[PDB]
Design a protein around this ligand. Structure first.
Ligand SMILES: *[C@@H]1[C@H](O)[C@@H](O)[C@H](O)[C@@H](C(=O)O)[C@H]1O
Length: 458
């Protein structure tokens, strides 16, 4: 008894072109203490990234970027060789960590193995302008201008007061002074250094004035987004995660207005479902695959240049979990990102849903792929409604579907895409071929409650 909905694809209703480096991941700066983590020797993790995209961006930053210190004079410690730095849980100060030349050297080899570009945090919370200049210089020397997309000067400077990185009086004016002192010092060592900022969630007292003041000094605006609101909200649940987020829609409009005003594009450089490394039973579940995959397309359709899902260690929300010693595994959220990866880049098209008020959390995105083939990504985020989608507007002799599936929305395992789990080192290929029945120039796709689908048309 599915809800019977219509989907009308309009090849003339042109949306944004998804860039090839749209996908991405965010990690804590602290992880750079361990030269074995972002290393050319870390073939497993490099494989996971390549499966997410042949192009993409690795962002390193986070709350630990205020507690992490480049030391050109240092070599990794024995403890550094086993450090697994998951998402910062925001409870108190992170441990002090040291980044060495060796770790930067190894990060360059990791970027060469993955083909991803880098956003690299510098320590404006507690470090000096001169050490940021020295760190930037070594990153530029070692990673190179082609792979280095941007430096960032502080992570979430609007929240520095929370753990005493700044006094409660710290405001945009104080941060602009800091930012300019760091920018000037860095540009003396690295005249071509690229920047992004302010590396926080959209707001009127920080991000808007940042863009106005520093629009000639940055390449793009870096924003953050978590589906979970402030801690006074009802605890985020799977049910809530599947629903529209009016805060997201408003902040995205805010970023679009900044782009119109300043010319600066925006990237979502730290995102995930829930704070503090995630919420067990929400962030580490199949629902996070549906949420993440749908978010990637929602933001692409809104004109975002890309995304970076925060993670690392064994954090509840991490796309990829594990360590070089123990191995790495794809978590449920990774499968949402994998659906996006398999769809590929291209230009979004109009895709209007009708007769869908009883299945209101179904989303759909149509894409003219760079290879000329039409694809449709659907997320049936309705937890209790199966759907039957009558697809009009596509003329093709053959459509196939790859399904994003788990037996329950709160599953922490049992997730597959195209009838297969992801294996070691990001290995994935589809194992189930399913055609979508076509008649009268239309197709009909069934989707179970709490599932996703990627359709490809010949
Ligand atoms: C973003 C912050 O910069 C990260 O260090 C945290 O791990 C995230 C989280 O709470 O999960 C965000 O605040």
């Amino acid at each position: 008894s599915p809800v019977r909905v219509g989907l009308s694809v309009d090849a003339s209703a042109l949306g944004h072109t998804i860039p090839p480096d749209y996908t991405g991941l965010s990690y804590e700066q602290a992880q750079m203490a361990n030269p074995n983590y972002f290393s050319g020797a870390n073939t497993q993790l490099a494989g996971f990234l390549r499966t997410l995209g042949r192009q993409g961006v690795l962002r390193i930053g986070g709350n630990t970027s205020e507690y992490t210190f480049w030391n050109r004079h240092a070599k990794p410690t024995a403890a550094d060789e086993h450090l697994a730095a998951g998402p910062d849980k925001g409870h108190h100060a992170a441990a002090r960590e040291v980044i060495t030349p060796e770790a930067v050297n190894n990060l360059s080899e990791f970027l060469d193995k993955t083909g991803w570009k880098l956003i690299y945090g510098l320590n404006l919370g507690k470090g000096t302008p001169e050490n940021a200049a020295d760190e930037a210089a070594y990153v530029m020397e070692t990673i190179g201008a082609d792979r280095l997309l941007a430096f960032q000067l502080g992570n979430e400077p609007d929240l520095f007061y929370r753990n005493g990185i700044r006094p409660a009086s710290y405001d945009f004016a104080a941060y602009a002074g800091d930012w300019q002192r760091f920018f000037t010092a860095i540009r003396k060592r690295v005249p071509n250094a690229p920047f992004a900022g302010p590396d926080t969630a959209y707001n009127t007292k920080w991000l808007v004035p940042f863009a106005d003041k520093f629009k000639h000094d940055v390449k793009f605006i870096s924003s953050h987004y978590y589906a979970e609101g402030p801690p006074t909200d009802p605890s985020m649940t799977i049910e809530r995660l599947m629903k529209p987020n009016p805060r997201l829609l408003g902040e995205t409009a805010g970023l679009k207005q900044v782009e119109a005003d300043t010319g600066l594009p925006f990237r979502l450089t730290e995102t995930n479902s829930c704070y503090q490394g995630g919420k067990q039973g929400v962030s580490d579940t199949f629902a996070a695959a549906l949420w993440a995959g749908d978010l990637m397309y929602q933001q692409a359709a809104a004109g975002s240049t890309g995304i970076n899902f925060h993670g690392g260690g064994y954090g509840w929300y991490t796309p990829v979990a594990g360590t070089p010693e123990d191995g790495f595994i794809a978590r449920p959220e990774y499968y949402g990102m994998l659906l996006f990866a398999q769809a590929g880049a291209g230009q979004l098209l109009g895709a209007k849903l009708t007769d869908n008020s009883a299945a209101p959390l179904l989303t759909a995105y149509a894409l003219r792929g760079t290879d000329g083939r039409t694809r449709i990504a659907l997320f049936n985020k309705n937890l209790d409604a199966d759907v039957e989608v009558a697809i009009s507007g596509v003329a093709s002799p053959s459509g196939t579907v790859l399904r994003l599936e788990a037996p329950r929305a709160d599953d922490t395992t049992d997730v597959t895409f195209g009838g297969a789990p992801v294996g070691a080192s990001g290995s994935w290929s589809p194992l189930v071929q399913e055609y979508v029945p076509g008649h009268s120039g239309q197709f009909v796709l069934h989707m179970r409650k709490a599932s996703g689908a990627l359709l490809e048309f010949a």
